[PDB]
Amino acid sequence: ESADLRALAKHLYDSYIKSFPLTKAKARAILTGKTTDKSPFVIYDMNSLMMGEDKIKFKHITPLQEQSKEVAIRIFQGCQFRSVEAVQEITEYAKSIPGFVNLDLNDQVTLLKYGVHEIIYTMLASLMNKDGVLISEGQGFMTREFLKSLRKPFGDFMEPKFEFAVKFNALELDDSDLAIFIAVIILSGDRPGLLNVKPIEDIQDNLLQALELQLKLNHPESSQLFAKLLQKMTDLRQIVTEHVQLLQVIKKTETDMSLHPLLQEIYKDL
C-alpha cells in the first residue's frame, strides 16, 4: 500500500535520524568548502596527525607514536572504538524495524552479527570523498595517502574502500533512502544459524517494496536505481569478506590486541 509505504518509509527515517548522528547530510556539509562555521581539521601526515591530537579529540598517546605502541595501532584500535559505537546505533535502528524485534531471539543477533559490518561500509561512504575520509564525528578529515602510507598490513586497509564509496555515492542516494537500504540488509535471511527464515524475508519484502518506490519517487531520473542499488550489496560482501581476512591476520599477529565483546562476538571468521 503506497500510502502505507511512504509511512513505512518515513517511519524508518526518523529512526535512522535518532540512531545515527553523522547523517550523510551533515557529513557532506563538512566535506564541501561552502559553509565554514567549522570545517574539518585535516590530517595528511604525522605533523598534522599529531597537530590534530590537540585540535581534535584523540584519547590516545598524544606525543610519540613509535616505541610506546606504534600509531597504525592507535589508528586501528581507533576504528574498533568507533566500531562498538556503530553496532550500538545499528542494532538500535534494528530495534525499530517493523516486526523485527519479534523474530527468534537467536536469529536477531545473527542478523546483527553479520549485517553490522556490511552496514558499516554502507554508511562509511557518506563519510568519505576521493581525497580522504572524515574522522571522529566528521570533526576531522584524514587523507587517503596518510593511511595508504601505513605499515605493511593496515596500509591497504582502507584504500579498497574508496572505489566502493566513490561509486556507491555516485548513485547519489540521500539520507531518506539509506535507512531503508540499511533496513533491507539486516533482514537478509541468508546467514548461518538462520533458525526460521521466511519471516525475515516477509519483513525484507516489506522493506524491498518500500525502499523500491522510495527510489522512483526520491529519484525520478535515477532509472533502475533500485536494481543498481540492490546490486551494490555484492560489493559490500567482498569488502566485509576481505576486512575479516585482515582481522584474521592482525590479531593472531597482534595477540596483546584486545577486542570489545560486541566485536569479540561479531568478529566471526567465515
Ligand X SMILES: CCCCCCC[C@@H]1S[C@@H](CC(=O)N(Cc2ccccc2)Cc2ccccc2)C(=O)N1CCCCc1ccc(C(=O)O)cc1
Rounded to whole angstroms, the Cα distance separating 97 from 185 reads 12
Rounded to whole angstroms, the Cα distance separating 193 from 70 reads 39
Among the listed ranges 68-76, 186-194, 197-205, 257-265, the one in contact with ligand X (CB under 6 A) is 68-76
CA angle 127, 131, 136 (to 5 degrees): 35
Binding mask 112-141 for ligand X (x = CB under 6 A): --------xx-xx--x-----x-xx-----
Tell which one of 45, 68, 249, 268 touches its own copies (CB under 8 A): 249
- Residue 20 binds ligand X (CB under 6 A): yes
Q: What SS3 state is found at 222?
A: coil
Rounded to whole angstroms, the Cα distance separating 161 from 140 reads 18
- Residue 60 binds its own copies (CB under 8 A): no
CA distances from 229 to 98, 189, 242 (A): 22, 18, 21
> Which positions from 95 through 154 interact with its own copies, judged by CB under 8 A?
none
- Residue 256 binds its own copies (CB under 8 A): yes
Cβ neighbours of residue 98 closer than 8 Å, sequence gap 6 or more: 8, 11, 203, 206, 207
Residue 133 or 203 having the CB closest to ligand X:
133
Residue ranges of the annotated binding site for rosiglitazone are 80-83, 117, 243, 267
Residues at the interface with its own copies (CB under 8 A): 2-4, 6-7, 10, 167, 189-190, 201, 204-205, 208-209, 212-214, 216-218, 220, 223-224, 226-228, 230-231, 233-235, 237-238, 241, 248-249, 252-253, 255-256, 258
